[PDB]
């Protein structure tokens, strides 16, 4: 529902709620100078990172990966005929099931209107054909 800055079709920027105190740190310095004196070169210094990846609000752009989507399609012994059951799996655990039908839709209801009541009777033999 709606494409937003932190959540859209292609990626999201997920941030958890902050459990810890919002601690304020100001006046960062080393023994040779203040932070702003070397911040130009601090991009190459991993020990000079001010953002910690364990923080709940650390920005990460994660691509929205399709979950494992399986066509339990018509060509399958489990499906009793023509059923394109679309399953989104987490390993083998089912997360969402989308039964696609109409692979055996033959317009019986439309055809029946063109037939007399006697002529339309054999159509019923072929709905539940056991």
């Amino acid at each position: 529902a709606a494409q937003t800055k932190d959540n859209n079709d292609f990626y999201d920027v997920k941030t958890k709620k902050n459990d810890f105190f919002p601690v304020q740190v100001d006046g960062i310095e080393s023994s040779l100078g203040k932070y702003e004196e070397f911040a130009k070169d601090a991009h190459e210094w991993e020990s000079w990172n001010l953002q910690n990846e364990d923080h709940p609000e650390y920005p990460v752009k994660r691509t929205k990966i399709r979950h494992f989507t399986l066509n339990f399609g018509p060509q399958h012994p489990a499906a009793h005929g023509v059923l394109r059951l679309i399953l989104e799996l987490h390993g083998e655990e089912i997360l969402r099931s989308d039964p696609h039908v109409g692979l055996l839709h033959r317009g019986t209801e439309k055809l029946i209107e063109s037939k007399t009541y006697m002529q339309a009777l054999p159509y019923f033999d072929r709905l539940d054909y056991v």
């Binding site: 040779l32 100078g33 070397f38 070169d41 190459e44 210094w45 991993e46 020990s47 000079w48």
Partner: protein, 64 residues
């Protein structure tokens, strides 16, 4: 205010900043970096010990 600062606080501060900036670039989590250094150190076993001072001179060149 001249040579006794160059051979003193101001001169050593510039030397410390140059050296410490080099060392700050060598601390980063990377498997390939530490594996290369570990395997490189094996040459101290292979090399005859008379070559230690040449390795010492080579290392100071790399600091530059």
């Amino acid at each position: 205010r001249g040579i006794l600062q160059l051979f003193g606080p101001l001169g050593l501060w510039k030397l410390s900043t140059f050296i410490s900036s080099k060392l700050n670039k060598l601390v980063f989590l990377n498997i390939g970096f530490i594996l290369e250094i570990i395997v490189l150190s094996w040459l101290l076993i292979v090399f005859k010990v008379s070559l230690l001072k040449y390795i010492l001179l080579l290392i100071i060149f790399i600091i530059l």
